[PDB]
């Protein structure tokens, strides 16, 4: 039957599943001779072809409870006065078999009433269901678990204490889940050896597990029709020696991973990031300032807790365009290995514009869910540029996605987990009640990326790329008085592309000199250009910019000595 | 427009082209809604070519000059850039923007996984000039005598839309002259009956020199010197450093 | 080249001695005018006269305590302007000239550039 094994992803909720459930159906006896209080119900949300069922349906084989599925639509089709049968026969069956497991698929059908509760009937099956919800009379161990798109979908008092008390965001899984997925999903198809499962994992994102599945099943079927079509031979019952010849090529999964359309890429993506230090070269006082105000309160809560101090959870990361803030944050969560949100200008645009500020609310609920995390408010002077930044609008900093912001700050704190950080292009707008203690007080400038810093981040850039030993790096990065990281990328970018142009030419041209005078023996003498030389790099270099002025630093420094440490204290001694 | 058709044809992938009238109308009915269905639209039909044809309507509606107290930011240009970051995963649709003032383009639409990619249109040289005449002239017949050549050459500065009007006036020209021939001869058969009847044809079968030059007489640059001074500034705003050019390898 | 040529012009008086590759300064100063230029030697020249002063005064103060006490060598702490001086230079080094202002430059060098589409102009054959 399904198990754990059966249940990819690996995206470390199912753990928590287990820890919840365990003892209730593991060791139910145990809880005979203990007084507590176990899991009555437990609510799966997160986006469709999840697996919520899926894992539902393991956990009650794995840990032995019947398992009983309640379709929401099941009930919901049949007549009405005699759903209410089916609802309370059910949970009766359930009752019989303890323990037992029901699970209530869509559950935001039975019951999707938020207050608006349109309809009788309607009214009354979510009534009945909260009374039978209610009704368990801690007798037996039946566990009613419940799947839902998200939990503001069902009705509230659902989302009460006692009929489902605790929750569980099974969410999309991520690059290493994606990976497992296929995995999971790629086991009898017998997959060739070119094929590694690994590009088409990294270049999956934005699918989930029935998404897997389905490009899976896409890839196949072009093997199949790729071949053994052709041969045309067929018969009742394909042969399964002849259906085994054929190998799934890394083609096939490309064309599907073209054909995918995943079914929720703007859904947030709450992941570790894979960002690492080694990324960034530099930065060290920098770097140790935020493994000090993340890192520290983690790795050693004792100490902190020893002088009766509260370690800031917020940082301002303040600087010139393209010198690494989303990277850094990003490396800074990796290290700590705790989730990522990172919420970019645009969503904070989107939701000023549509005066609609109460997504701050749920994105700061769905960080608080995925703790321990890193929740990276980009380029959050946005808004203020919308509005001006020389005259603006008539009134001051004030709006109402930063009222928000400050508003879910002041009620933040209690998780002891979520880490803001802010990373802003235009300190001089930012709102000056964002800085107040309790918000992002400690104001970090992320300076432009020096000589060594530079290197670094061009064998960042080009790590992938083939680059010969000739191109000198150093000298390149030295060469770069004040280019930015993202000049650099630029000028890497462009090294490539010409890299690429002149390997497409001569193939081309190479291809025309066989048309042309057919050759008598063929020998392929391979790749005229096989890596990035020298030229290449000197030609990019030829187009390469200074995106960053002098004088927006200049400003940048102006701010940096805005918060100066004052003028007459640094030689302060104590009277001895 | 017509070189993303072509780039388009050339891929042969399908061609979505949201001019500014649709953006206008989605800025001033507050239906930003519309740009998620239009990316939807263009992922669907893969591979596609989204063009976003005069980007700069909004802008434009907004000012430019003084414009609103508030920033190049607008709701249209922002779901545009946020379907834009949210895009690239389908892999075939490909964005290309048109815009005739760049110096009020937001400037996060050029910011990189945007139109990163500025390509500067200058107005056709005298070989662009001539094959633009050819192309409209290719239906309509004209008389090999009329050199076109020479007519391209002859137009020092002329857009492709000039030489589109001088060729559409020239050939109304040459309508309104045979229709008004024709329309007397008929007068001549009526007032007096020919005992024998023998159609001399028409009058005017193709486009002739004179059609051509009494349509030249109202030949006119609808582009100035000026603006195209503005274009080659932004041109020269997007300079490449002025002091790597010698850029050499230590060896 | 006309970096390394300014450098060579302003440094010929001075003795500098020939360890200090004069054309890796010139083509670190990435846009330095001639005035930077004439402004960063001028420092190495003035870092080379105050250490010089300095340590044949310092030598002098200790060896006039005892009379004819050390040897009648006669040493020259520095005799030209050393690597070390022309990294002190550099410390300070400035960039006079900002890119707005030589953007403002090449603009009018376009307003006065001769209109276009007269390149291809070619008498009839
Ligand atoms: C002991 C303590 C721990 C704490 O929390 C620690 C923590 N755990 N997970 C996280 S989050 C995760 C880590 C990486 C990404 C984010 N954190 C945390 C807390 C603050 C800043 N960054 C992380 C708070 C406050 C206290 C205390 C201090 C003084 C006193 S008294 C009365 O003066 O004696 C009483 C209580
Ligand atoms: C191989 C590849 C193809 C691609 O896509 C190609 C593509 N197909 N249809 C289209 S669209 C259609 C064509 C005409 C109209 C539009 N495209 C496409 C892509 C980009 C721009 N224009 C077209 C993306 C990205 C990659 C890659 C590059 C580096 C690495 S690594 C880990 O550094 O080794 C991994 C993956
Ligand atoms: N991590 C996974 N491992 C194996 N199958 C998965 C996984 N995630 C999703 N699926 C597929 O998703 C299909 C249906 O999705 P389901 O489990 O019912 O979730 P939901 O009810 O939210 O749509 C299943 O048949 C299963 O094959």
């Not at chain 1, 006065?81 to 059908?109: C, Q, T, V, Y």
């Not at chain 1, 309607?122 to 798109?149: C, F, Y």
Request: charged share 30%; aromatic share 6%; net charge negative.
């Amino acid at each position: 039957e399904v198990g754990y094994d059966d249940i990819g992803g690996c995206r470390k909720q199912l753990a928590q599943i287990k820890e919840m459930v365990e003892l209730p159906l593991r060791h139910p006896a145990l809880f005979k001779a203990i007084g507590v209080k176990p899991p009555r119900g437990i609510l799966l949300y997160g986006p469709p072809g999840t697996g919520k069922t899926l894992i539902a349906r393991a956990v009650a084989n794995e840990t032995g409870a019947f398992f009983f599925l309640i379709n929401g639509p099941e009930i919901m089709s049949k007549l009405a006065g005699e759903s209410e049968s089916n609802l309370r026969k059910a949970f009766e069956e359930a009752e019989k078999n303890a323990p037992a497991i029901i699970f209530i698929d869509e559950l935001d059908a039975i019951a999707p009433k938020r207050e608006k509760t349109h309809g009788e009937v309607e009214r009354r099956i979510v009534s009945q269901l909260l009374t039978l919800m209610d009704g368990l009379k801690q007798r037996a161990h039946v566990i009613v678990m419940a799947a839902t798109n998200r939990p503001n979908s069902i009705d509230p008092a659902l989302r009460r204490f006692g009929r489902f008390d605790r929750e569980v965001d099974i969410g999309i899984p991520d690059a290493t889940g994606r990976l497992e997925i296929l995995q999971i999903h790629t086991k009898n198809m017998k997959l060739a050896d070119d094929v590694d499962l690994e590009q088409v994992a990294n270049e999956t994102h934005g699918h989930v597990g029935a998404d897997l599945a389905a490009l899976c099943s896409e890839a196949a079927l072009q093997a199949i029709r790729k071949k053994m079509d052709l041969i045309d031979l067929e018969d009742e019952t394909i042969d399964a020696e002849v259906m085994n010849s054929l190998a799934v090529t890394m083609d096939d999964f490309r064309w599907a991973l073209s054909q995918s359309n995943p079914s929720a890429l703007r859904e947030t993506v709450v992941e570790v990031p894979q960002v690492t230090w080694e990324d960034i070269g530099g930065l060290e006082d920098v770097k140790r300032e935020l493994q000090e105000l993340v890192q520290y309160p983690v790795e050693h809560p004792d100490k902190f807790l020893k002088f009766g101090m509260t370690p800031s959870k917020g940082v301002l990361f303040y600087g010139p365009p393209g010198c690494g803030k989303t990277l850094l944050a990003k490396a800074i969560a990796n290290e700590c290995q705790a989730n990522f949100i990172s919420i970019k200008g645009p969503e904070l645009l989107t939701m000023w514009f549509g005066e609609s500020e109460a997504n701050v609310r749920e994105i700061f609920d769905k960080a608080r869910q995925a703790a321990p995390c890193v929740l990276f408010f980009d380029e959050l002077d946005s808004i203020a540029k919308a509005r001006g930044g020389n005259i603006g609008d008539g009134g001051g900093a004030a709006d109402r996605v930063i009222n928000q912001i400050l508003t879910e700050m002041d009620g933040m704190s209690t998780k002891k987990n979520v880490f803001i950080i802010g990373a802003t292009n235009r300190p001089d707008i930012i709102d000056p009640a964002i800085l107040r203690p309790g918000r992002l007080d400690q104001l970090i400038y992320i300076p432009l990326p020096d000589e060594k810093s530079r290197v670094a981040i061009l064998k960042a850039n080009l790590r992938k790329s083939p680059v010969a030993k000739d191109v000198d790096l150093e000298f390149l990065a030295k060469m770069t008085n004040g280019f930015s990281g993202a000049d650099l990328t630029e000028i890497c970018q462009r090294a490539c592309k010409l890299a690429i142009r002149e390997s497409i030419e001569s193939e081309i041209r190479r291809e025309r000199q066989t048309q042309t005078n057919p050759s008598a023996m063929e020998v392929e003498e391979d790749d005229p250009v096989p890596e990035i030389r020298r030229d290449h790099f000197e030609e990019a270099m030829r187009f390469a910019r200074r995106s960053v002025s002098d004088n927006d630093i200049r400003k940048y420094e102006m701010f940096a000595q805005t918060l100066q440490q004052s003028r007459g204290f640094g030689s302060f001694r104590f009277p001895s | 427009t017509l070189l993303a058709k072509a780039i388009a044809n050339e891929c042969q992938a399908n061609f979505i082209s949201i001019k500014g009238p649709e953006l206008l109308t989605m800025w001033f009915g507050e239906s930003e809604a519309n740009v998620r269905e239009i990316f939807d639209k263009a992922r669907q039909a893969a591979p596609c070519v989204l063009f976003f044809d005069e980007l700069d309507s909004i802008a434009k509606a907004r000012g430019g000059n003084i414009g609103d107290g508030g920033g190049a930011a607008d709701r249209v240009i922002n779901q545009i850039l946020t379907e834009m970051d949210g895009m690239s995963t389908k892999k075939n649709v490909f964005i290309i923007g048109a815009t005739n003032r760049p110096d009020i383009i937001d400037p996060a639409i050029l910011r990189p996984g945007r139109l990163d990619q500025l390509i500067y249109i200058p107005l056709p040289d005298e070989k662009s000039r001539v094959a633009i005449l050819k192309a409209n002239l290719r239906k309509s017949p004209v008389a090999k005598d009329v050199d076109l050549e020479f007519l391209a050459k002859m137009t020092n500065g002329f857009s492709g839309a000039d030489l589109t009007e001088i060729c559409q006036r020239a050939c109304k020209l040459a309508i309104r002259e045979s229709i008004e021939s024709e329309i007397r001869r008929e007068r001549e058969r009526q007032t007096n009956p020919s005992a024998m009847e023998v159609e001399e044809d028409d009058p005017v079968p193709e486009i002739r020199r004179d059609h051509f030059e009494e349509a030249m007489r109202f030949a006119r640059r609808s582009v100035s010197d000026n603006d195209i001074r503005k274009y080659e500034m932004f041109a020269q705003t997007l300079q490449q450093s002025r002091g790597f050019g010698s850029f050499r390898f230590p060896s």
